[PDB]
Amino acid sequence: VRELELPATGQHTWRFGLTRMLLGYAMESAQGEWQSVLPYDESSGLIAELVGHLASLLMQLNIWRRGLAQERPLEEWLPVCRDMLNAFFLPDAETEAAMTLIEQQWQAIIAEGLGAQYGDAVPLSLLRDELAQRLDQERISQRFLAGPVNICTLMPMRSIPFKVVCLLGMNDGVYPRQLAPLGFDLMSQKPKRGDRSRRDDDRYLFLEALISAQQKLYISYIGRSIQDNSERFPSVLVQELIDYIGQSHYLPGDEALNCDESEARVKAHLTCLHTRMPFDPQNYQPGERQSYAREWLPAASQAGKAHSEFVQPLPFTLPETVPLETLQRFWAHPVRAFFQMRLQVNFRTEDSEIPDTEPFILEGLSRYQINQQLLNALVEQDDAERLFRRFRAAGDLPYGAFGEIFWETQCQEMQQLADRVIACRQPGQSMEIDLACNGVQITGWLPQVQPDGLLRWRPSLLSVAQGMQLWLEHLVYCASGGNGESRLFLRKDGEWRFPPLAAEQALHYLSQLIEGYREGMSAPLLVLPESGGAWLKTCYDAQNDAMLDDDSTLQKARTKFLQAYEGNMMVRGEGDDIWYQRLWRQLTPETMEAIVEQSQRFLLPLFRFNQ
Amino acid sequence: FEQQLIEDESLLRYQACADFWRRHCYPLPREIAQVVFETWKGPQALLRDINRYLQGEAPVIKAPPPDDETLASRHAQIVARIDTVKQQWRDAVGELDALIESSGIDRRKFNRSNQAKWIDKISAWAEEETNSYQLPESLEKFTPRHPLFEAIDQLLAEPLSIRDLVITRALAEIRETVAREKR
Amino acid sequence: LEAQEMLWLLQAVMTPERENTLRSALATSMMGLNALDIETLNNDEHAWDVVVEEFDGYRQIWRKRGVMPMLRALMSARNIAENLLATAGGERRLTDILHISELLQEAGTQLESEHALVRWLSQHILEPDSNASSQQMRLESDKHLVQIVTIHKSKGLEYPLVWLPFITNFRVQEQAFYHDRHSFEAVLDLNAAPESVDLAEAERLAEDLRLLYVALTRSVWHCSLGVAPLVRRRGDKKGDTDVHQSALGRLLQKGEPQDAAGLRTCIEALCDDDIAWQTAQTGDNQPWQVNDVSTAELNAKTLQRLPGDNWRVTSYSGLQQRXXXXXXXXXXXXXXXXXXXXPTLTPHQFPRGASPGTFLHSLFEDLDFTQPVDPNWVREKLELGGFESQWEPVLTEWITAVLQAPLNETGVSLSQLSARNKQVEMEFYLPISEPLIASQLDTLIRQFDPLSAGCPPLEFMQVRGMLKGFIDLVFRHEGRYYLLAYKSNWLGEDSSAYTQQAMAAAMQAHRYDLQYQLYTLALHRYLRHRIADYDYEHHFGGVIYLFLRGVDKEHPQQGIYTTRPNAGLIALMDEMFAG
Amino acid sequence: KLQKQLLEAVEHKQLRPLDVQFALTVAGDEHPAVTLAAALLSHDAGEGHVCLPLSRLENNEASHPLLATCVSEIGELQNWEECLLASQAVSRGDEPTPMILCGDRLYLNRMWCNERTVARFFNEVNHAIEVDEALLAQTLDKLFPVSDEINWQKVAAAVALTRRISVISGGPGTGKTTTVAKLLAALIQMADGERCRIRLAAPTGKAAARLTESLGKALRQLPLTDEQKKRIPEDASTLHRLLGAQPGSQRLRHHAGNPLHLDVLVVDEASMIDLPMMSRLIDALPDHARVIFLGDRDQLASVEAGAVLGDICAYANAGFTAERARQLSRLTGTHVPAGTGTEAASLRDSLCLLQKSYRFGSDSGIGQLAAAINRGDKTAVKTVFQQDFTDIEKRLLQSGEDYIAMLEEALAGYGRYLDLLQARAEPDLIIQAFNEYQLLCALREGPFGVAGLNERIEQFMQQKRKIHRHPHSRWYEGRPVMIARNDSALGLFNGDIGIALDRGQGTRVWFAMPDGNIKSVQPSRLPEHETTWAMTVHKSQGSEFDHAALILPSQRTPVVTRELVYTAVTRARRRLSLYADERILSAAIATRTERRSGLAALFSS
DNA sequence: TTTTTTTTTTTTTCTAATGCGAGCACTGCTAGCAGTGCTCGCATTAGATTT
């Protein structure tokens, strides 16, 4: 760190990490910090062997970065490459060929140096970039004339008579090839006869290849960039050639027309424009140029049938016992369920790449976790300072001052929420639930039932889906005894509070939920817990306990719907998710209605009893 | 003679910005850091502010801070600049010499409670909104009072920030550093 | 999303064994499967096993032929390339798929692993960058398209009919950056003092005018442009319309604020025979009327003759090859026996591989036989080779044992050979005219060859073409030529594991039989060519395999091996290669 | 410093690189006694010892003359407790310190916490449950017909019914499982109106399945009403799945916050329970839960560091507490012997040891030899020598010309199987045939090992016509394979065998389910597999073969031990064969596996 | 040197501007009161380029 003149931190370095791992091996993380390093719990077992291997790597990586720093005379550089290769590498049947090439090339360089009598110390960055050039310099021409059709670049002084010569990539400026003279060269100033210059070499090759082809010459170039449909051009040589052809010949169709007109006519007859896509049916129209690829044929014929609407009704039979966790997991994202729950498809996105820098600020689920721990500490009225030390040692927070600052704005938000939590909290005991709803036995567990009712708190923004969760978990609670309220507190002072309900209405609404559940496993029920929630926010009127009708608001709920579905350029919209991508690529106003109808069905009892 | 081009200059640039924000911020004591935090969280945003100015010809900065001034210097300066008004308002408090007017609403005197309360520590960078009431340009529109009553106007004339200095130092540094690493 | 689907597929084909990571790939819109498909396909085990199977063949195509061949096979079998084009809009999707594949080639070569490619694709799914080649290709050039383009990217271009829907819009610059009117120098004011803000916002407006100009000069026949009573300030009903801050508005109002009515009038004022204004009335009838297309019958031609027959230039190495079936041919012996019984300057310890052997050979390539060995010369060979000094005193002795060993019955010492009688590393090309069939040969071999009794008949596919090889050494003694070939190998042994018997054993194990016979054919034809009045029996001395490690000062026989082609086998063999 | 010293023991391979690196980081710059001491702690903890009693490290001084290392400065630091306990890398348990020094035993913080949890759970936490002795005795009387002699099993049931936490030790085929069924029956029929939640856990999904089928068939035998047959547990699961161990993390959905909701828990094959999983289990239990462990005292110990069931059963040797013997004498309606003296009442009472094996007796050479394993070698060479018992044979392997002959007998070991394949039979009887004979080798690799023996045996199949092999396919018909890791999809578990064969539908692998059904899986479908001609002794635990053949390598390696050989011996149902040197084996039996833990000290104090 | 397990979810912007609502001082009109002029504060809504 200090070598690069960045202030010594003491965190986020392979020393910090390793020490964190080993210390994670000796002592459980829950014990606490030690030197202000938090033991990293994950490797506690025999697995931890790997760590020792890892730490043996880095030591070497450390040692050598010191050994390579100082300049050296060459014969001091001779022994190095061997120590390094055999140091870091274990040769094998494949590799030994390679490693021998490394030593051979390296020591070839240095030997070139010594034999020239060069005394001064040398920086490594001189040789490292010589050897890079030396290792790729080699070419393999072995199979040239083996007999398989020959692909190869145009090489000076290689001209082999052939029956068929093909030329690709004649686009202007790509060929001929350009390497300017050095510019302080004296030869390029006053040329004599026998001078060789790369451009004249290419220009002469293109003549050789012409003289060499004994039957069919084939010349190709990219007319139009496939990507933008820009224009491209033929090399000047091809241009001269097509010019000469067109000026020396005429098609038999018009034997009296004109010089230039017969010219552009011929030049049109010789030039073929192949299409942009292989499945373009023009290729397959019977004629002279016709494609032998039969794999694209049915595509060009346009003989395929379109993809049916993904949703098809599927039979399902509700068991007698539904574990409450199954219902909970269902209603969280009712669409996602039918993919994972029912038919078992789940799309696992690739894991996130390791970030490149120590955390400057905390965002996303990173800071969310911290709010979770922090809050669960404040509600217990345990000291936040201890936990602070835990994170700091964990290297999790921004360094130093900003750790303190960020920490003490968060403590100031989660303190605000924390009190409001502490106000109503009466410690309570978990309860197990068994019920008969529509001849279906629900079993489950509810943690921490206080005499007053359900209390739940999450450091989140107020959103409906949370609401549905507390709604289910509430109705099951009313459904078995449990007179009392249910409350949920969230950030920016959000709240969901559901008054108590009699066993009758409890079992009736719970019925509606379950019926939703067997509805789900059959067809991918479309209920969007947020966007639909947004649409139902506008229409419903709590004072009249009736959803509004008038079309003025019905163009409010649409704008507030789409606004919720697709997001801003800031917040990602509910509408963008892999689970909703599989159903429709583009939202039809019809499907919009379909969502509004079902959402109106299940969601309504939420807003109706919320207070 | 052989130049290897690089078309992604945003990654080197961002790299350098994190380098700056490491050496010129990590050393800050709590109280100055508190001021840095407000104007931008971290170099991710700072880069977003100066980014158009890192690229292409360097602009000329109107009335640049002197070359020798640090953050602690500017900060101590502004500390005292507010402090004088703090003592002074604490001294002149407790008197109605003003000509009372309808539109200026009598509860405006409650503002003064705030200010005599607002005068405790220097840790805040933000003066109170109620201060806008004591501007002689503000009040005289609705009674010259005494000088410090006018001094608040001097205090509120130039916005109090560390911003210009940081954008200056960072803009000069990040440019060089990038150029060096590419060299 | 198509890149993502591609990820799900490649990731599945990589490890179809896993139930989940496959089914995921099946559900993709690309595969185009219903919920009923996946549902039933979760039930019947046979179908599921069939899918697993086909993907398992795909992995094979993946490993052998590369990537793009695989995705080709998958597209054909699944019929997706067709079913997308059937689907509406799916044309775009299909272009994306093909494009991505084309990139998986470009990154596919440079990376050797099959797996590190799936490594790579994810990493690009995360960071898309800006870069040119990964930028999207135009969806279709078949149909003329609406070419919807930004102002700046229209500069110097020409657009026969031109639309400026949003032109009214404006952006008030909050940043303060301007130019001094005097010095004409770019000045940034880090302070928000309103003057400089104004001095800049004037600039922002003039620039907006220049945008308007450029935008209007683009059209050839017709340009249409939108106009609205746009309001920036958030108060609803005033009589404030900020359009005078729009580039265009200022040109209609002559830089005068108006009301929306005044806006409408000022539009009406200039409107004669060129400019014509209609009110903006939202309406929807029909998306558009395609009326579709008619094409034809169409078919692909199909080759009749074979693409091409067998003409190959091969060495004897291209003969042993590998055996598919009950018998597989390898240099090493599969059977192994464990040993439970319980000076470093030796030949057996020398390193092994193509690399060590190439060194060993390359010694004798320049090496001088008549002079004894110079240890300095050794050290500087090993040094060049990269071999340490652990070798130089160990080698320089051994070589002398080699050069000093007498050979065959003539008792020739390698040392006795003058550079006039040496020929080092002859490369030859031997044409084989009619296809050379194994069984039509190995019978001729076995017939006259005692050594070909061992092991099955050599098997190589029909071949017609040229044959290559390097004679290690050719030299003449007593007016009589010889053929010399060095071999090294033998990881396991040092001592008499090289005998008259075991040498002949290994010869039959690595099939150096056919090899030496082939060379003898070559050397034969070369002498018949070069030597006026050449005769096989008169001038020719036999064949010598020298196992370098095999040479020991103790036993003259160990390591050297000699046999003579029958002169009756070559007589017919040469004829065979002639026709 | 002594750092570069420690760089040698890696060349000497006396220290793992992990050990050295650990000692470097944690030990810091302190007196080299700290550094070396720590490295040795990490080493012994690596080989599976829980602690490092200072006696050993001060007495050996093998890594350095701990005079000069141990005596540094500041007067006398030579006291190891002094010098070590001085530095901050060691503490008494007060601070959050990497290492703990408590009983003269220096050892890791993690091991000390898990250690203490285990201890306190076996001593104070378990309680005495009280019921009517007359009614209970009657229930047992209807469970167990024969009253005429002392029944160990009846004692075991009585004990486990009295004590909240109880262990039942015994050899393979001593009737453990049946006994457990008897117990559970007494449990359900004991509490009529109370909810009885039974849970069945085993450390390996394979053993879990074995337990499922076992207690299914065993519980079906005894009369129960539909209520009881509802309170019969459904299935058994993995220990992990029970604790709900998340695949990536170390988090547990239960731990101390969530007690897993049970009445009783039965962990079969507790020998494989190691210390970390034992503690992490214990944190999940409620205060009403009754737990029972199953395993042999001498079974091969768990891989990860610790020995639990061993250190526990070691105290069974003393026997029952004086009074508990009288209580049980009232319970079983018999005379229960009483262990003389007082050591620990709570622990001694919790342990029952089943000394009767119904599978084979003393006349069978397997029980006599296995019973002679716990003794010295002069008994084992005797048994292997005299009378031959017809159930046991030893073949000398020294020269490879003997080894070839070993393979020669291995043929006839597989003979019936090989023919049944040549006879071209149906898969079921083939699979059942494959379990009569098995090769067991300790090491994985080399001349003697699963990895080597698969090669040599198949090569020996190519020498003598038995089963033809195609090199390119890699799946010649008849090759047995086994699964590397558990699978939820195909319902097959790690440690399970299946036979590759072509029924004519195609090349397909055939597995025998615990339900008797045969499932054919495509080769591509299999998750992981290893050629199963030879098993390591470890993986063979819980299995039973009619004829087993043990192979011990010639060298002396820390893997070859007493318990390894023991499990190999008890592995065969009836027939057995051995291949070893009398010196390598005879010395191997003398060396017992010890893993140092304070438990022996903890239960006495 | 030997080896066992298990499956998944979470969050989301900030700044600013107005519109109104509530509370108050004055002042004029018929000492109190109503209105108006006013002013601040709370919630709600809107917008965030160009190779």
Numbering used by the authors:
A (entry chain C): 511 to 1121
B (entry chain B): 148 to 289, 304 to 344
C (entry chain B): 591 to 932, 938 to 1174
D (entry chain D): 2 to 606
Which passages does the manuscript contain on this structure?
The RecBCD/AddAB complexes are highly processive helicase/nuclease machines that digest DNA from the broken end until they encounter a crossover hotspot instigator (Chi) sequence. At this point their activities are modulated to produce a 3-tailed duplex onto which RecA is loaded. However, it was shown instead that the nuclease domain is actually a C-terminal domain of the RecB subunit, the activity of which is regulated by RecD. Consequently, RecBCD has evolved regulatory mechanisms that suppress activity unless the enzyme complex is bound to a bona fide DNA substrate (i.e. a broken DNA end).
